[PDB]
């Protein structure tokens, strides 16, 4: 905040308001120039460093007039600082399939899926959506396992796959998330050839496992393993809060010799 221009200005400002008060006190109808530095900075940083107030009737109006800029500067600093932490909430957040971003071809983010999947059968039937994958046909990975790794290095940004596989990845890696809502509902299923003598018993056993709670044990044990699920800032930014005052701790040790130089 305040960029650079005001900060070399206020330092120049605090410098100039220091000198003229002494000049406005020497030729007056009883302090010294030493009070100038302490009074000038003392009002600013809400400190009790200063010793006393001027004893006159000409610089009295200066102190009050000076008190305003102490209030305004500290008012503006806190005013804009909280605005960035709260109000500023910009994000793109591509949402839904109905968004036109999917309809029009996109070069920044490409569209890809796993080759020879059910989605390939899906997109190749409806002539309405035979508009982009007739172009992104060149992007079709050979395995859903390695495609997730491609997104990890920010190579890929759009991927069409079953929600069961995709969501569980967000539970393991703590840096991936989904968006939107489902748009093609179809369950899995044991498959076999026609007229196989097991087309009647095995379907009944699957249903009987649903009621007896067996699928509760299997889903919880494998899928739902659970992991990690923001005014909590850390050393990424405020580690620089308290090293300049720490730096100033070791920045005044040589000033003692500068200070003690007046002894001799």
């Amino acid at each position: 905040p305040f960029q650079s221009t005001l900060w070399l200005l206020v330092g120049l400002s605090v410098h100039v308001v220091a000198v003229m008060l002494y000049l406005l006190d020497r030729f007056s109808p009883a302090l010294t120039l030493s009070s100038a530095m302490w009074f000038s900075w003392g009002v600013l940083l809400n400190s009790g460093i200063g010793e006393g107030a001027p004893r006159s009737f000409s610089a009295r109006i200066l102190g009050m007039v000076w008190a305003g800029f102490a209030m305004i500067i500290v008012a503006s600093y806190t005013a804009n600082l909280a605005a960035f932490l709260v109000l500023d909430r910009p994000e793109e957040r591509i949402t839904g399939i109905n968004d036109p971003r999917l309809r029009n071809p996109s070069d920044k983010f490409i569209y890809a899926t796993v080759k020879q999947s059910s989605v390939d059968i899906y997109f190749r039937r409806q002539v309405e959506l035979s508009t982009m994958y007739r172009h992104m046909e060149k992007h079709n990975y050979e395995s859903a396992a390695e495609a997730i790794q491609a997104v990890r290095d920010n190579k890929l940004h759009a991927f069409i796959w079953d929600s069961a596989v995709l969501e569980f990845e967000a539970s393991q890696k703590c840096d991936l998330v989904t968006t939107g809502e489902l748009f093609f509902r179809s369950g899995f299923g044991i498959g076999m050839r026609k007229d196989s003598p097991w087309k009647q018993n095995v379907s009944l056993s699957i249903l009987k496992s649903h009621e007896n709670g067996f699928m509760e044990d299997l889903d919880k044990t494998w899928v739902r393993y659970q992991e990690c699920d923001p005014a909590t800032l850390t050393f990424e930014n405020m580690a620089g809060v308290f090293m300049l005052v720490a730096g100033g701790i070791v920045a005044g040790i040589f000033l003692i010799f500068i200070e003690i130089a007046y002894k001799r």
């Binding site: 809400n46 460093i49 093609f184 800032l233 405020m238 809060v241 003692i256 003690i260």
Partner: protein
């Protein structure tokens, strides 16, 4: 499936939530070292350890406590640097601590269908109430694996879905057990969507609907393909929006009334 929908229930959290515990407690040790360097400075020119905390800690909380001051010229530059971040720390504290203070809590009442509170409703407090409507599938399933339950909800058996919803706001019964698809439609329909299912829509036996046919009937083969074909053409995906669309979204009051300020008094405790 089978779901449970109950009435919405009516918070110390962290009164010091801004920043974090790890990056904060480490600050206190720094107050020791910064005061120590003043002792070496104050040794030259014209007790100190004890007064330093009063000389220093009284500055971070503005300045109201009577605070002394070391003499000299080079012995006062350091605190001027300290005073700079004295206003910096307070400004960060007052960025959005009010919004985080009034943060609500998504309370819960029941762990799930197999929650242990359901097994022994008479084991704690005034007895819990939960009921179904018999002559069906949900009643049949609940009587094949939880036979201990069935001796209890026979007390309450409503005339239908409509009457049960009205009686739920009263207080006589505080739960419901019925078909999942029907209950979701009611829940996402009422005034202010106060009525919410347990655990934000958890099902317990995923069995679909269907069209019963005569045994061995030859219409089964081709009728299955027709239904399957519509799923790949996005028919019921938009058809459900014409009949099964909710009204609410399952997501001032400038008051404090203790709330989390008890922790502040708990500190003084």
């Amino acid at each position: 499936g089978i779901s449970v929908m109950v009435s919405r229930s009516n918070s110390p959290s962290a009164f010091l939530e801004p920043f974090s515990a790890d990056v904060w407690v480490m600050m206190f040790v720094m107050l020791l070292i910064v005061s120590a360097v003043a002792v070496f400075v104050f040794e030259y020119f014209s007790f100190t350890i004890g007064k330093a905390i009063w000389l220093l800690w009284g500055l971070v909380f503005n300045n109201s406590v009577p605070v002394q001051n070391p003499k000299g010229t080079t012995s006062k530059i350091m605190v001027s640097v300290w005073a700079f971040f004295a206003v910096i720390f307070l400004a960060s504290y007052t960025a959005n601590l009010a919004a985080f203070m009034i943060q609500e809590e998504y309370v819960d009442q029941v762990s799930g269908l197999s929650d242990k509170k359901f097994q022994r409703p008479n084991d704690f407090s005034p007895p819990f109430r939960f009921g179904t409507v018999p002559n069906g599938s949900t009643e049949r399933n609940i009587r094949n694996n939880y036979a201990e339950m069935h001796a209890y909800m026979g007390k309450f058996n409503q005339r239908g879905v409509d009457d049960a919803l009205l009686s739920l706001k009263t207080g006589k019964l505080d739960a419901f057990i019925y078909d999942a698809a029907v209950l979701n439609y009611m829940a996402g329909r009422d005034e202010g969507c106060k009525l919410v299912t347990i655990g934000s829509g958890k099902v317990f036996a995923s069995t679909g609907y269907g069209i019963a046919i005569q045994k061995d009937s030859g219409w089964k083969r081709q009728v299955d393909l027709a239904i399957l074909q519509l799923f790949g053409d996005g028919e019921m995906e938009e058809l459900e929006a014409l009949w099964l669309t909710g009204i609410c979204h399952n997501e001032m009051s400038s008051q404090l009334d203790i709330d989390n300020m008890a922790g502040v008094f708990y500190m003084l405790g």
